[PDB]
Nucleic acid binder design. Sequence first.
RNA 1: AGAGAAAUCAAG
RNA 2: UUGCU
RNA 3: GCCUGUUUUUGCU
RNA 4: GCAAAAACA
Lengths: 552, 670, 621
Amino acid sequence: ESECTLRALVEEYNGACKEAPKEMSKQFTDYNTFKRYTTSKKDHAPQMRLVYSVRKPWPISMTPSKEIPLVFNGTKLKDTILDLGESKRTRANIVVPDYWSKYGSQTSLEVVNAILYAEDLKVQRFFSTEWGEIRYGRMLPFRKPVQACPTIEEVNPASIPHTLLQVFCPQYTTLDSKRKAHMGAVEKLKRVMEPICKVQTQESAVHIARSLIDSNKKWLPTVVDHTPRTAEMAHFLCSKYHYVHTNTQDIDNLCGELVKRSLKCRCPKETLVANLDKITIQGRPMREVLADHDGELPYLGICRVAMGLSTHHTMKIRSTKFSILNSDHPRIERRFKGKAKVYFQNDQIQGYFSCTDRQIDEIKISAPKNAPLLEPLLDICYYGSFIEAFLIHMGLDKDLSLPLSPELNWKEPALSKVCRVTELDSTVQPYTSATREFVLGETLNVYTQHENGLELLICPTEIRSTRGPLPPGTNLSGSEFIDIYQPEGYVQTGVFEEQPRCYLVDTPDHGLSMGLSRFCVHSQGRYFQYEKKISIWEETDNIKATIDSQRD
Amino acid sequence: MNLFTPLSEINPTTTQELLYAYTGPAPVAYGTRTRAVLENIIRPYQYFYKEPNVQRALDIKTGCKEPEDINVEGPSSGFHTASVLKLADNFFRKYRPAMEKLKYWILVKLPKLKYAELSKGRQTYSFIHKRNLPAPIALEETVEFLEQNLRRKIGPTLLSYCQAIADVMELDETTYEGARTYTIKFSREELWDQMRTLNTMWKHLERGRLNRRTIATPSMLIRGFVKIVEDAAKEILENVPTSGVPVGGEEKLAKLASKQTFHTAVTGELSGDQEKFNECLDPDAMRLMWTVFLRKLGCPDWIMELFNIPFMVFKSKLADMGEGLVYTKGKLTDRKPLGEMPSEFDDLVRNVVGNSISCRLGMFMGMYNLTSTLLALISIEREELTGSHVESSDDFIHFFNCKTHEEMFKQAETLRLTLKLVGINMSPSKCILISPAGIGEFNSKFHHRDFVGNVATELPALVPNGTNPMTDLAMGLNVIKHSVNTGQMNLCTGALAMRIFNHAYKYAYMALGVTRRTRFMEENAITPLLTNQGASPVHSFSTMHLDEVALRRHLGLLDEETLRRILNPNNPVTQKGDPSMFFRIENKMPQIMEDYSVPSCFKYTLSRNRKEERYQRVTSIINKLFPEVLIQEASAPGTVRESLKRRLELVVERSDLDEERKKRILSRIF
Amino acid sequence: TDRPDHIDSRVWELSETQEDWITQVHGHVRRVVECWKYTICCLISNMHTHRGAPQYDVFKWQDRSTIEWICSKKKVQYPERDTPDLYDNERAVAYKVLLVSDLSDHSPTSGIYHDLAFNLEGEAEESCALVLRGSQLQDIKGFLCRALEWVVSNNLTQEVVETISGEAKLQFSVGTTFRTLLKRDTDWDVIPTPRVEPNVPRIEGRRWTQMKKLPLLKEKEGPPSPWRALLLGADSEYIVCPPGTDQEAISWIHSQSEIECIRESKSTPASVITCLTSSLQSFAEGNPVRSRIHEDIIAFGINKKQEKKQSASSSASGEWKRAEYQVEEMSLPPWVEEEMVLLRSDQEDNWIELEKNAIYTEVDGVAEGLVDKYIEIVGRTKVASVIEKWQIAATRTFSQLHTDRSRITACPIITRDPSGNCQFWGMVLLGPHHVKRDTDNAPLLIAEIMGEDTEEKYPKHSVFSLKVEEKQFLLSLKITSFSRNKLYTFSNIRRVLIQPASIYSQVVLSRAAENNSLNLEVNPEIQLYLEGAQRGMTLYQWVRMILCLEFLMAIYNNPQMEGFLANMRRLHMSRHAMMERRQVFLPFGSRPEDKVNECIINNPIVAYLAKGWNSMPNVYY
RNA sequence: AGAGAAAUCAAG
RNA sequence: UUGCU
RNA sequence: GCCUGUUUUUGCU
RNA sequence: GCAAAAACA
Ligand SMILES: *O[C]1[C]([C]OP([O])(=O)OP([O])(=O)OP([O])(=O)O[C][C]2O[C](N3=[C]N([C])C4=C3N=C([N])[N]C4=O)[C]([O])[C]2[O])O[C](N2[C]=NC3=C2N=[C]N=C3[N])[C]1O[C]
C-alpha cells in the first residue's frame, strides 16, 4: 500500500532529526559533497583472507529469519543462539545457500525472466550469430576505439539523464527537460524496465537502464578492414594469429540517406543547409538526431560538421582509405606540398608512403604472401598525382631482396624488384592527439585545421550516391524541401520555489493534452509554471532574422 | 639466459615475458625510513655543483645556475632560467590548440571543480592529528577547521577552498575544537609548518628494484592547490603529440605506433629512463614554465598566483624523517635523530625542524608527474631536434630520422643537453639507442614488429577476490577477457588461465575433494548445478563475457525450479537490513518501499571479525525522497531539512489518499 | 562544447571575441550574461517594421565604424564608453538593456538613453513594460526563465548574481603575511619576473660511444650458495599410503615408522624431531593443535629476542656507530644445473589435472586442444609434482595463520593420486605465530621427504632416516621463519605454468599463421646456445626446461632477483638488436652492466642466469 | 638458533 | 578438526 | 604500513 | 559517486 510507504518515509525523516541535529541544517546542494563520505566501507586484501573466511565455523552473516531451520538433518545451519537482533546479526554456515538452492521458496517465472533479462540479452545474442571458419594469419592490429556493447537505442550522452528521468520519475521533470529526452528510447526502455523495476532497487534500475543506452567506447586492437560494431565478442573473433568472419550489421544508413539537402544546396547558399535543419524525426529534432549517429558516412559527416560537431570519416578512394600522418602543407588543388607521410589501408593490405611534392620518397607495405598489389598502388598514385608509369616513377632495382615484384605482387620472386618499397614496421593506426577543428565553408566542403594554412577537404560532396529509403517518421513540414519526401507551443514565464496560484499537473505528460492555459510542474523543490505562447514566432528564426538585419 | 634466447622460431623480444619473477613474493621494507629519506634530501645538494659541495649548496633558494655550471658527465640538479624562458616560449608558440584548450579549461572547468574531488585520494597526512587518515576524513576535518576558523561557509568549488586556505593562513592563531571533548591550537608558524610538511612512509610490495624507496604524502592544505595545477597540466598534455602520460592502455600503444615512421637513410630509436627524477628538478622551474604559459595566454594575476602557490609551497617542504638513523655500539641497536651523533648526513643538521627536515631543491615526491612531464616536453622544443619524442613521467622514447649517423649523434647529444638545461638528467646506463630503428621499449612495453604481449603482468591478477562466488567469477572471467582483448594473452594462454582460475576458485569455495560443503551436498542429495558448487564449468573461452546463471539456463543445465529458488528476491541469505525504494513504472504510485534481498542466494556477505554515519543516513533519506538526484546533480534550494519536508509534503499530497488520512500522515512529520 | 542549451549557437559564436573574458571575473558567466542581453535585444527587435525597415536596430556586438555610420545617418552622436544596445525609429529613443536583481527602485542610469531593466526571472520595469508590447514581454520572460532554470540546474545563482550586481570579487587573493611566508624559500616573487633575456646557450657535450660488444656480467667469488628456499624442489619425494583422510594417513605413518638421526646440523638440533613426533601423534588423534612440552623453545625460538638483547648488553663495549650492514657474496653452487637436469625427468602420473572448459565454437575447440597439448607435454614432469607439493603446503600453512595462538599447529602435506592412495610429502609445524602484520615472520619446522642428501646443498638441514614398512626415506627437519604474504603468494604458485604455456602457444600459433592451417602437433627445432655452441633442441624439451627455470626463479624471488630481472631486459633487448645487424650506441658514462652487477650478490639462480648470459657470445658479426 | 637483507621478525 | 594433483 | 598520476576489471550506490 | 583488485611510471 502507498500508506505503508508514506509512513515509512516518515519516522525515517523524523528519525534523522534527533540523532543528527547537524547534517540537516546544511544546504541541500551540499549533498553533492557529503555523498562521497563512505568511510568504514574500506578493507584491505579481501583475496588474501577469502579461503580462511570460507572455512570459518560461521562464515555467512545474514539478517535473522525463520525460513532457515536451526538444524537440518544433523547440521546446525545457523548460529542464532547469540546476542540476536543486531541487524546483520545471524551467522550461518557456507552450506546455507546450498540448502536454499534445493529446499526454499520459489517465485514466479516472470520474476526470474525480469532478473535475467539483461544477461539473457547477451546470452541469446551470442547464440544468434553465425561463425565462419577460422583463418590463421599475421593480422596487424589497428587499435581503434570501438563501442563496448550493443545498445537498444543510440542516445547522445547529453540526453541520457533526461531520458532516464522521463523513464523513472517523470513527475519531477520540466518540459525543457522532456524535449531533451529521446522519446522512442523512453518508450522502449519503459517497456523493458516495467517488470525489472519490481525486482530491482532504484539505483540498480537506473544502472541497468543506462547500461542499455550508453556507448562507453574502449580502445582495442581490431582487424583493419573487418571492424566489428561492438567489442562484446572480440576476445574470440579476433586475435593476432586468427580471425573469424561474421555477417551481422544493423537506421544509421537510413539517417545518412536522409541527407538529401546537401545535394540541392550547392547553388543558393551555404546558409540554407544549417537553416533547414528544423525537421523532427518522430519527436526528435534534427539537432538531437545527430550526435546520436557517429558514422563514417560522408553526408552524415557534413551534417555533423554543419552542426558544429566532429566527424570520424576518413578519405576513401575506390576501395582504399588514406590518412595524413603529418604534412608540412596541406594538399592543394590535388598534390602535396613538401614532405608528407600518408597511411593507406585496403582490406588486409596496409602501409604508409612518404613523398615530397609529386615524387614518392618511399613506400612501406605490410601485405599477405602472394597478394596482388595493383589497385592499392594505383590508388596511391591517383591520391598523390604522381603518375600521369608506376615502374618508371619509382624505378627498378637489381636487388632480389626487395619484396615488390615488377608485376606488383607481394614477395613474388623475379629477376628484378621495385626499389624504395619495404616491409612495414607497425606504422599503422594514425593518431591525432588534439581534437580536430572541423570548419565548413561554401560548396559544403569539410575542412580541418592545420598548422600552416587551411587543411585539405575530407568530405568532397561531389560523390555518386544513391536515393535509398528515408528513415520512418521524418517530418519535412517545417522545411522548404518537402519535395524530398516521395494549438501553439508553451513558453515558461515563471520559476518559483513555492506553490503558485496555478494548477499543478502530475507530469509533463498528462499536461500539454487537456489544453489548460496555466499549469505548474515540479523539479527539485522548484515549481516551473507554463502558461501559453501569444507570440507567433519562435526564437531561433527570430535571432536569424535580427542578425541578418545587422548586415553592413 | 641462454634458455631465454631463441634463434630460429621466435625472437628474444617475445621471450621478455620470461624475464619476470612474478608469481613469486614481492620484496618489503622492514625498518626505519630515515636513511632513505635523508638520502633523498641530500641528493639534490650533491648534484648542484660539478664538485659535490653540500655546505655551499645548502644556502641557495632558487636552483638557477649558469650554463657552464651544469654538469654534463653526471646528474645536475637545477635549471637555467633563460633556457626555461625560451623553451616555454617555443612550446607555447607551437601547440596552439593545446593552449586554446587550456584557456577553455581555465574559463569553464576550473570554476566548476569541486573540492570534494579531493576525496578521491588515498591515505593523507592530517595536520590536525599528525597521522595518516583516509582522504574523506582528512577533507572533512580540514573543511570543518576552515568553517569554524573563518566564521563563514565555504562554497562547493575548489577555488573557494583555496581562498579559504589563503584566508586562514592570515590569522595569527587558529583552533580546531573537534569535540569527538578535545581542543588543539595553532599559530601562523605552526599552521605554515603543518602545510609545508610531507609525511613519509616505506613503499611495500614494489617489484623491479633492488633498493627500497620511500614515498611521501602531503596534507589537505596543499592537495587542493596541487589539484588545479595537475588538472591544467592534464588538459595541456592530452592535446600535445609528445605526451605519453595522459593516454594509457591501448590508446598509448596506438599513439606510440603512429610515430614509428622510419623513412630516412638513418632511422634510430632511443629508449631510456631518466635517473634521479623528482629530486633533480627545481619547483621554481615549474613556476617559471607555468607563469610563462599563463602570461602568454593573457591570464590575469590571480590565475598566475594560484598556479604558483603549490610549487612555492613545495620549495618550503618539510619531509618527515622516520624513527631515526640506526646505530650499533656492540650487538645492540638504537635509533637516534640526525643531530645527536655524527653520520653521513651531518651537513643537513641545520635543516632539521623538529622531526622534519627542509629541502629547497627537488620535489622529494612524484606529486607533479604531469607538470614534470610538461617541463621535459618544453625541453624538447627547438629547431635542432627534428625527431619524435614521447615522455610520460621519466620514461621516454625518441625516434631520429637523420640523413647521416653523425647528425643522429648530434641530435641525441642535443636532447641530453636540453634535458640537462631543464634538469632532467637521463640515466646514461638505462638509455639505449639502436641506429636502425625497429626494436624499442617504453613503459615496460617492448616492440620489435609490434607491441609484443606480456604475461606475468596479469598473473598478479587471476587470483579470486573475496566478495562472493558470483562476483569472484565475474572478476576472473572479465580480467582474463581484458587480457585476451589487449593481446597479452592468446587462445591457449587464455584458456589455461580460465582453467587455473576456475580450479582455484572452486577450491576456495570448498568445492573440491571431500569438504564439509561437499559432504553436506552429498548427504542431502543436493546436485551442484553451479561452478562454485562443484559442477562442471559452463563458461568457455568464447563465453567469458556471459553470466553463469543465464548461460546455464539457456543451455538447459539449470532447471526452472532451481532458478525460481536461487533467484528469490525474498531469500533470507542476502536479506538487506533496511527497506528499499522500488520504482513503479506505469503506476499511479511512482514509488514503493519494501524489504529487499539480493536476487541470487550466492551473493551473500562474508562476515568479518569484530562516528560520521549521520552523513550516510542523510544521503539515504535524500535518495529515497529525491529520485532525480540519482540521475542528475542535486540543485534543490534551502537547507536539507526544509527541502526534504516540502518534498515529503508534496509526495503525500499526490498519494491520492483520503484527506483526513493525508492530514494524519502529515501531522506525524517533525 | 561550453555553450548553454538555451543560448543559440549563432549568439555563442558572435560572443567569442566581443570581450576578453579571461581577464574578467567569472568570464564564462559574464559571457553567458552578455549573450542573454544580446538575445533580449534580438527579441525586442524581433520583426517589427516601420517604413520598410526594422523598427529597432541593434548596436550591440556590431562593427563599430558601421555603428557610427548608421548613427550619423540619423544625425545622432554617442559617447564611446557608453553606447545604447538598440535604437527605435518611431519614438526616436535609444534603449539600453540592463539586468538587475531589484525593480522596486531603479533610477535611470544615464540621461543620454533610457534603460530596459529586467529581473532575473522575467519581470520588467514599469516604463520598460509600457514601452514594449505584450508579445515582447512574454518572449523575454520565457527566455529569462529558461536562463534561470539553467542557472539553478548548474548551481550558478551566486555567480550570476555577483556578475549582475557588478561587485566582481577578485575570485582569488593572497594577503600580505601569507605572501611573506611563501617567499621565504625562493629568490622570486609570487609571480616571478626574472630580468634575463630568453636564450638557449650552447653547451659542449660528450660523444656517444658504440657498444661494439655485449657487456660481461661479473661472477661473484665465494662459498657456494646453499639451498635457501621454503621446501626441497628436486629432492622432494612422497610416501605412498592407503587411501583415506589426512588423519588416517598420518596415523598409519606414525604407527608404521621409525626415525634415526643420520646427519645433524648445528642450525637445527636433532632433538627437535621430538616435536615432529608429538605433532605426528596429535594429528593422529584428530587434534592438529598440541601443547608445548620442552623442545618447542629451540625449534620455534620461543622467548628469544630477549635473551639476545641481554647477551648483547652484557657484551656491549665501545661507542655507538652507524650500522653498515653487510651481505655476504656467494658463488654459483654446483647444484643449480643438477636441479635443472632434474625437475625434467618424466613421472608416472600427469600431476596437472585441470577441469576442461566447455566447447561451443571452433575457436573454443582449438584453444582446448592447445591447452591439452601443453598439459600433456609438461604434465608428466617433476616440476608439476613439486608445484603441487608447494601449493598444498603453502595453502595448508597459510590457512592456519589468520588468527593468534600460542600452541603448536601441525599442517600435513598430503596429495592424492588418481587411484586414491595418499602421498605424504612432509609436515609443516607452526609455532606460536602471534602475527600482527602480513610481513611479520612466523616460526616453522619443516619436515619433508628427501631423495638425496648433500652437506653443501643443505647445511642447515638435520637429515633423519625414516623406515616405513621395509622402505627407507630421508627427512629434512629445517627450522625456518616465513611470512603470511609469501605463503599467500606460494598458495597460488600454479600460475607459473602460464609463461612456458605462453611461449609454447606463441610458437605453435606462429607456425599456424605462416601457413593457413593449424597442426597442433608441431614440434619444431628451436635453435639455442647451450654450452656456447649453436645447437638445436625440440620445442617440448625447451618448454619443459623453461617451466623448470621459471619455477626455480619464482621460489627464489628476492630484491636481488627482482632488480636483476628488471635491469637485464635492456641487455636482452640489446642482444636481440645485435643479432639483427643493428648497432647499439650508448651515452658517455653508460655502463648498463653495473646496474645489473649490483644485483648479483648471493642468489644462486641469479648467478645461474648470469653464467648463462656470459656463456653465449658477446660479439655478433 | 633461524628467516632475512642496507633493518626488521623471532610477541606483548 | 583434517581431502586442489 | 600502503603516496601521486594514468589506464583496466568488477560490484554497490 | 563509492568500494575492491591489477598493471605501469
Ligand atoms: O564522477 C562520475 C561521472 C563519471 O562520468 P563523467 O564522464 O566524468 O561525467 P558524466 O557521465 O557526463 O555525468 P553524468 O554521469 O551523466 O551525471 C552527473 C551527475 O549525475 C549524478 N549521477 C550520475 N550517475 C550516472 C549517477 C549519479 N548519482 C547516483 N546516485 N547514481 C548514478 O548512477 C552524479 O553524482 C552527478 O551529480 O559521472 C557520474 N557518474 C557516473 N556513474 C556514476 C556516477 N555517479 C554516481 N554513480 C554512478 N554509478 C559521476 O560524476 C559525479
